[PDB]
């Protein structure tokens, strides 16, 4: 018996071009450039996942350091205060705390300013 390609290759191609929807020019319309583009989207996604984690923290940090410079200090010291002060409850995620709950932040500043000296 002979098994000719038939339906298989059209399917496999369709799958991928579907994934490529929205991509520019041929990259959406040609199975090859679709596939090539996708390799690239695949590794960026993975890589950018790990880095979304970085991208966010570095935002939180600027935001803290911003808010507590109103209260006259470094992010640098602030964290150290909070380290000594036992307040290792983090944050840096919360940081809406600095924005949405200013006083609760301020209290947190003062618990921080007074630690180990």
């Amino acid at each position: 018996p002979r098994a000719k390609t038939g339906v298989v290759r059209r399917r496999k191609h369709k799958k991928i071009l579907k994934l490529a929807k929205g991509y520019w020019g041929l990259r959406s319309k040609s199975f090859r450039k679709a596939r090539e583009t996708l390799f690239a989207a695949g590794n960026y996604a993975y890589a950018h996942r790990k880095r979304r984690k970085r991208d966010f923290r570095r935002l939180w940090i600027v935001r803290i350091n911003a808010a507590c410079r109103q209260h006259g200090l470094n992010y640098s010291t602030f964290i150290h205060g909070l380290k000594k002060a036992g307040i290792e409850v983090d944050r840096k995620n919360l940081a809406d705390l600095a924005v949405r709950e200013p006083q609760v932040f301020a209290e947190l500043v003062e618990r921080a300013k007074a630690a180990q000296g």
């Binding site: 935002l59 939180w60 600027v62 935001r63 911003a66 940081a95 809406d96 600095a98």
Partner: protein, 138 residues
């Protein structure tokens, strides 16, 4: 819990004297303000910044021999179209522009960096346009 992000904010203004302030050291902050990395809601992709007005910019002062030795260069497009302009010459011809330059180079690059630079309004000597609030900052 998503991270908070500003809704449309009020464009606060700010006034600066610059007379006797150094240059890049004055520039550093003018940048920070422009970005608004002093505001706790700071967002990278938006630019809720302060507008900055700077006066007495003929009067920035700088250290070392820079007034003579420091050169600004301008390449036109053309053969031998690189222009070389000393600090003293600049200040004497267009005072400021040196602060505008120092700040611009300190703002980020791309569509948004170029916008923030519009928000820094620099004048020579005293006064300026009196429209907004412009709390004096030192």
């Amino acid at each position: 819990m998503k991270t908070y992000v500003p809704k449309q904010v009020e464009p606060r203004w700010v006034l600066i004297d610059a007379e006797g302030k150094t240059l890049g050291r004055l520039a550093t902050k003018i940048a920070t303000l422009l970005r608004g990395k002093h505001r706790p809601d700071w967002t990278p992709n938006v630019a809720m910044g302060d507008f900055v007005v700077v006066v007495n910019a003929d009067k920035i002062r700088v250290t070392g021999k820079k007034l003579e030795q420091k050169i600004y260069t301008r390449y036109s497009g053309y053969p031998g179209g690189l222009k070389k302009i000393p600090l003293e010459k600049m200040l004497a011809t267009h005072p400021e522009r040196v602060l505008e330059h120092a700040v611009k180079g300190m703002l980020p690059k791309g569509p948004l960096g170029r916008r923030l630079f519009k928000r820094l309004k620099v004048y020579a000597g005293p006064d300026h346009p009196h429209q907004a609030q412009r709390p004096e900052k030192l």
